[PDB]
Amino acid sequence: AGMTTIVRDLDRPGSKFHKREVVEAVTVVDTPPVVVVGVVGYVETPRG
């Protein structure tokens, strides 16, 4: 879909920015449910 940005607190002990807010880019993937229609069987062969 595209990106947006967030603010979150940081849980990183030893970081200087521990328990403070950071602004992070996030990508949003639009995920409607998938429809299961088939199955495929795969045997192991000496050629793959």
């Binding site: 940005t5 603010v7 807010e21 602004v23």
Partner: protein, 63 residues
């Protein structure tokens, strides 16, 4: 997550937006976009810029 104020225009600055400017006499100016940044650099007065909050308060629009 403290929403700031544009120093030129009075718009609200959400996190990540715009630029902060520390002037050489140590006064902090926050801008929501490069429009406010550029008209600050151009020495424009916010009281004469017709869309800014400081214009509209002095010309008594929107009460």
């Amino acid at each position: 997550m403290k929403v700031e104020i544009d120093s030129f225009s009075g718009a609200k600055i959400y996190p990540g937006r715009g630029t902060l400017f520390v002037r050489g006499d140590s006064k902090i100016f926050r801008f929501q976009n490069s429009k406010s940044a550029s008209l600050f650099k151009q020495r424009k007065n916010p009281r004469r810029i017709a869309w800014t909050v400081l214009f509209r308060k002095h010309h008594k629009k929107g009460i």
